[PDB]
Amino acid sequence: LTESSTSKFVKINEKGFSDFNIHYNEAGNGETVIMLHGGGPGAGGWSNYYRNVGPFVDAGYRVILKDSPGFNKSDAVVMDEQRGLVNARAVKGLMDALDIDRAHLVGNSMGGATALNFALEYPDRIGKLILMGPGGLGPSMFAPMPMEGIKLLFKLYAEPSYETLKQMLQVFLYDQSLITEELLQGRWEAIQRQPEHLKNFLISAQKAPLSTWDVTARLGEIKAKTFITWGRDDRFVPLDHGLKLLWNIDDARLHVFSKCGQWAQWEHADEFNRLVIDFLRHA
Amino acid sequence: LTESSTSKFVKINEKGFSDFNIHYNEAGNGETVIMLHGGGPGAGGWSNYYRNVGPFVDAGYRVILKDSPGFNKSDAVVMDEQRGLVNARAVKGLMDALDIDRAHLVGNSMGGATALNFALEYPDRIGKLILMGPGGLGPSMFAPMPMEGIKLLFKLYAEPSYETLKQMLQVFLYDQSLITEELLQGRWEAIQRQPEHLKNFLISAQKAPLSTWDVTARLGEIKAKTFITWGRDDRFVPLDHGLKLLWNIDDARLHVFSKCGQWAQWEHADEFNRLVIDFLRHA
Amino acid sequence: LTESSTSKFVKINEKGFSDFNIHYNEAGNGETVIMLHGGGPGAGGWSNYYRNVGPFVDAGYRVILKDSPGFNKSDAVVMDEQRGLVNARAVKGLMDALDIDRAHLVGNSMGGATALNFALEYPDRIGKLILMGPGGLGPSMFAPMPMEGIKLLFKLYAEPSYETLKQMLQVFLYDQSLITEELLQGRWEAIQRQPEHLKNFLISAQKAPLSTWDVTARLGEIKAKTFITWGRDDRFVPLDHGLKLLWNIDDARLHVFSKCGQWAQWEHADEFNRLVIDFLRHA
Amino acid sequence: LTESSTSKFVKINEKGFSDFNIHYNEAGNGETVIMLHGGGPGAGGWSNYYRNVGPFVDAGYRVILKDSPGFNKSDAVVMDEQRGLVNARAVKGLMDALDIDRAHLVGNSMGGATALNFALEYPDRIGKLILMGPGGLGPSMFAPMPMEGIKLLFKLYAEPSYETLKQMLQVFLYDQSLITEELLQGRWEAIQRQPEHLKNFLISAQKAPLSTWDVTARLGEIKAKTFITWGRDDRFVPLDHGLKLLWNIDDARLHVFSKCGQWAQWEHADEFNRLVIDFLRHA
Ligand SMILES: O=C([O-])C(=O)/C=C/CC(=O)c1ccccc1
Ligand SMILES: O=C([O-])C(=O)/C=C/CC(=O)c1ccccc1
Ligand SMILES: O=C([O-])C(=O)/C=C/CC(=O)c1ccccc1
């Protein structure tokens, strides 16, 4: 599987969206799993889930690696509402366009916020819910905020540079030997190719600050079986939010990976893939 | 499989132990997994792991459900050293007697302390390490101590009664509908059959208080791949000790079950069995 | 100062309350501090704040030890709304009746919930806010719920007895040598004198469960300078809620007493009195 | 009071120290309080405690603002042992030279480690112990390490620059409006005046990593009355270590300031001064 061979576009119409272009990468043909990426400059579906798409397809799923609005090859947008909800509407739009009745959702940081909002707004359209360090769930009981990683994320948005990108990636990853030239250059290319997404993200954040993403009060509404994952060493979203989700969602479990930042799906790909595939098959 | 059909005895000789009788229940014939029980009155290997022995044997393991010294059908003993270490010596004694070179260990509360001490003392004799709410790892950062469940455990030791047993089991289990007459009567029988174990446990606790069990300072020595499980609703051993283990053991991961007390292996048997079997096969 | 010499009654009219009798104990004549008690059977203003009223009066305050509705010598009531709000309305009613423009509030457990609701509903009528382990602020990130102490509180409500009262007091207090015959008999007398309050509390709890008390979402509205106290060893309200308040209230500080249960004002009276008096004078 | 008018030097001889020059600033003449500074480049006694020395002297104490070895105007040194212990020996040396029988200690970060080691090694020479976010107490249960601030501290040590100093100070302080030209230029001057301290600190850290500072196992030995302070928003030393100290020291209390980094004594000087003075007078 390659980015090019799996690349697709679909125009969506849902709520505020009118013929809005969504890019995604699709492989496989079984039960649908939509994987949703984080919010840093240059993020996208393929790069976030590169180590996961193959094994999930091998397991029998149809994997859709979705670019959220205002990221990668999806249309540019300035959002005046919290991103989780707007992104969730885009997932619904994509599902309607493709005739997908129910999807399992996997979401990391901003994508975990998206997945939470989707489960709240469209409970009849979600199967299982996999939450990898979801962002925007209010204050931490231990971590000063904004967290170290989020400061760097905003610095890169405002002053994009190759060196600051490298600094951000060093904070994202526990094992900094995963930062090869290929992956650094690749993310840099995503930033260079669409400078307007960076501007727009900052304008959006002014209109709808991170506090607006906090759906904590509604977590008791979630009926989907939920699998929460965290990196022990996550410097972007605080580990105690894994406990917040565990206490407030009805049917949840929490798995914490040691020696791991924001991307367990990268740093611990084999264990991540096995755990999540087992959850989807058997929970 | 039944308790009777799997029941075995072996005399051990290791350090202080001289022809000391150990009871265990054994089934299967593949790689050995020794499962180690908790410290409440009437605890034993069979009752603690009744929902687990079958699936593990089906998966290809040889399962040994060990009665620790001073519990169930093993010999009575008064211990003047911390129980984790003494119990670990007994595991070594059993392994030597049975010609088992290496075992995977699964240990709950007192059995998790045992398994930790075994990994520290005999690193060349352990495979993988599965720790289910291990006891005696020092103070909690949040939970007043002694914890609610441990108070009840000591009350039952001192004043054994059917009603206090029921009270203890109600605190052990999140879902109190698991407390059938069969299981209540069965544990009561274990207490009634060996009153001297209760006396002896209390004398032992005076000679070696719970603070003596704390091996926190040595956790960095553990080389075994480690899988830590906790119940979210454990009223016996504090949830933040799961984090303590995760931070201090080199290769660990933490899984927390919602709606679960001290016995995930009972309340969430199917998920527990799948996770642990997958860990043993693939981690 | 004695209970008898300070005892007063006032009829209140506020919202649902119509000529509702409120008992309180008053001493001193300077700036008003209203102290609000907990929710266990037999609770009341005098017994909760016996070690505090003298020093606060000596410092120049007028102290009002208020009996909340459905406790001690105040009128019996069945509440169908969360107790914090109903109690806060009663404080307002008392203040209006006595021509008190602004009061400092001190509140313990249920009284801390009361004080929070008062600050939210009547911001122009509160001075400073002192919160001693406020109850009902949602789930803990660490403590299974209902907490050990709250189970005992409900047991005593349902099956009042001298022995269960003693058990509850043993859990309330870190230092169990504070439980003299005088204080045990005194609380027992409060329970015996008004059995209907016990019945009514249980009916109220059915109509408005503890989750209904959770005002977490509104904490950002509080403008009052806030001093949060906790006992390290509190088995009734979880220590991490002290952190929740600290993160969510604008101008707060947190003081945690070691070797202390729910009643710092009893177990650490001198330090408590000095700290709170200094806060009222100088913060 | 000024730095110049209070400046003194004393040669010490204790253990490894032979005619080792210690700089300190002294004012007042009552009971002695020795205040011990943090470990960042350019740290020293005067700058760390500038807002505190006056009020403490006004309260009747003799204040000694000590420069630890390898900082500010004290002699340069490469340490091969953990800094807390070496620094504590220097405090003892200073006390012996000046005929001070007992001192109260106030210590921030590295100075809190110093104060802990002093209380452990020389219990008959300490009065009360005030610990402001002490450093080196092992892993956090929540914070990835090295913490954000400590990374910056090491960056400035290795690559000193005015801009990196400003970045470090922005992370130290919750309220960044406290960073005036005066204070920025002043700290820069301390760095410029003694470049060898920076080199030496880095060599020392190689010989004795932060894990070597962890005295957690010995905290139960401390008999001194202890007052632990933390900033809620401390990005250098993790807030859960305040709880670790509270659980493991016999007679401790914990005060957490909101909207506060590593330096409560700066950001909340008036409240800090009142609390600590009250503790010294009355606890
Ligand atoms: O959601 C995201 O942040 C996302 O696109 C994931 C990107 C992974 C990534 O850029 C990466 C870079 C270097 C090494 C490993 C991974
Ligand atoms: O180690 C132990 O505590 C142990 O022997 C486990 C016993 C399980 C148990 O007594 C039980 C009782 C009722 C329902 C489910 C389980
Ligand atoms: O709000 C309350 O729970 C309250 O009325 C306080 C009562 C204190 C109390 O009953 C007590 C009993 C024994 C020893 C010390 C104190």
Ligand SMILES: O=C([O-])C(=O)/C=C/CC(=O)c1ccccc1
């Ligand atoms: O121990 C230390 O880090 C110390 O010397 C304290 C210095 C305070 C400081 O540099 C500061 C700078 C700007 C604003 C306020 C304070």
